C-alpha cells in the first residue's frame, strides 16, 4: 500500500550518464513502478526483457529494483546481455547468466557527441581477468603489458587502462554513443518495496 512515483524518469532523463568503467547504481524502493512512461516515450528502443515480458511490468511486485546507467558504443549494445563475452561485458559491465531484468538502450548521438572529439566517456581496455557480475572497476592503477615494470610511470607497454572512444556526429551509425540503462530486479522471495499500479 504505497502511492508515490519513484525517480525512474530521472534515471532516464539524467543530464550526464557515467562512463561504463564507473556505471552508476540507483536503489529504487517505495515505488509504484509505472512502466508506461518507458515504452510510451518516443525513441527508447530495444526494450529487451529477460525472464519477464515488457507488457507484464504492471502486475508484479519486485523486492529491490536496481537501475544501472551508463554509455557504450552502438556495436556493444548486444553484449549488455546474459551469456555474452567480448570487450565491454568482460571487464566493465558483466551481466550474470541468470539475469531477470530489462536492458533498455537508445541512440544518444544527438547528445554525447563532440565534433572536436569526445574525451570524457572512457571505457577500460586492459584487465587481467573477467569481472564477476555487477562489479564496478574504478581502479586507475596502471597495467603491465611488457617486461618493463611500470613503477607509477605511463609509457610504452605501460598503458593507462582507461581511454575514451571519441564521439564525432559524423561517426558511423554503427558506433555512435548509445545510452543504456539496465533494470535488475529480484522476483518473489521477500516483502516487496516496489509494485505495479493496482
Amino acid at each position, epitope marked *: 500500500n504505497i502511492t508515490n512515483l519513484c525517480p525512474f524518469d530521472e534515471v532516464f*532523463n539524467a543530464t550526464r550518464f557515467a562512463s561504463v568503467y564507473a556505471w552508476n547504481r540507483k536503489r529504487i524502493s517505495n515505488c509504484v513502478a509505472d512502466y508506461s512512461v518507458l515504452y510510451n516515450l518516443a525513441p527508447f528502443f530495444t526494450f529487451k526483457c529477460y525472464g519477464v515480458s515488457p507488457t507484464k511490468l504492471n502486475d508484479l511486485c519486485f523486492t529491490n529494483v536496481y537501475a544501472d546507467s551508463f554509455v557504450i558504443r552502438g556495436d556493444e549494445v548486444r553484449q549488455i546481455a546474459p551469456g555474452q563475452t567480448g570487450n565491454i561485458a568482460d571487464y566493465n559491465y558483466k551481466l550474470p547468466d541468470d539475469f531477470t531484468g530489462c536492458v533498455i538502450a537508445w541512440n544518444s548521438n*544527438k*547528445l554525447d*557527441s*563532440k565534433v572536436s572529439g569526445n574525451y570524457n566517456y572512457l571505457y577500460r581496455l586492459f584487465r587481467k581477468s573477467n569481472l564477476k557480475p555487477f562489479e564496478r572497476d574504478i581502479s586507475t592503477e596502471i597495467y603491465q603489458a611488457g617486461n618493463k615494470p611500470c613503477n607509477g610511470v605511463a609509457g610504452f607497454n605501460c598503458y593507462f587502462p582507461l581511454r575514451s572512444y571519441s564521439f564525432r*556526429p559524423t561517426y558511423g551509425v554503427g558506433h555512435q554513443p548509445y545510452r543504456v540503462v539496465v533494470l535488475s530486479f529480484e522476483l518473489l522471495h521477500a516483502p516487496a518495496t516496489v509494485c505495479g499500479p493496482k
Partner: antibody
Amino acid sequence: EVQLLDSGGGLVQPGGSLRLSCAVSGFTFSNYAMNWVRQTPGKELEWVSAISGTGDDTHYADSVRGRFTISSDNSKNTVYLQMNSLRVEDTAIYYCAKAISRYPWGCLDYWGQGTLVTVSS
Amino acid sequence: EIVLTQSPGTLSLSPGERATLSCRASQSVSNSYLAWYQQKPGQAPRLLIYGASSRATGIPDRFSGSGSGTDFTLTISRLEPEDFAVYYCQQYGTSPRLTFGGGTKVEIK
C-alpha cells in the same frame, strides 16, 4: 514549441561593448546547445558563436575570436553574448537559436524573433 | 571544407505548382546530415527538413526531400503563397562553424 526572447540590441560606437541576452523556456537547458547567428541587413547569414548545452564548451567565428565572449546560467535559464571592440562590419540583426545537439553541432530548430545591433559614430 | 549550392530554380514560379530544389555536395556528406530552412523577407529562418530525410515539427507535408552521396533534392509538391521565400543548404556535423549557402529566392510571375 520553446519560445525565445532575444533582448539587448542597441546603438554602440566602434570600439565599444554590448551585452545581448536570449531568454529561453520550453525544454531542458542542460540538455541542448545554444547557437548565435548574425545576418547583416540585406546580405547572407553568418554564424558568430555557440555554446554547449551544459554551459562549458564554446566556439566563435574567426571574425569575432578574441572579441566576443559567450556565457550562460542554468539559474536564470538564459544565454549571454558579451562583445567588445565592435567594428563597422559587426552591424546586423542577431538571432539566438537552439541546436538539436547537446554540444555545438547539428542544425537549428527554433529561432528567436531577433534583435537589431547597430554600430555607427 | 564542404562546398554546396548549385542554385538554379530561382525562376519565378506561380502559386500552386511543383518545384524541385537541387543541392550538390562535393564530398558525399556522411549520415545525410543536411537540413533546409525557409525565411520570408523580414523574419527569422525556420527549419523544414533535417537528417536530409526527416520533417521537423510545425512543418506541412507539402515539403519533402531526399538525397545521398553528392546529390540532394528538396522537392516541394505545390506552392501556397507563404512558400515564396529563400531556402538554404546547411551542411552540418563537422567543425561546426555552421553553414549558410547563397540561398534560392522563388518569386511570383
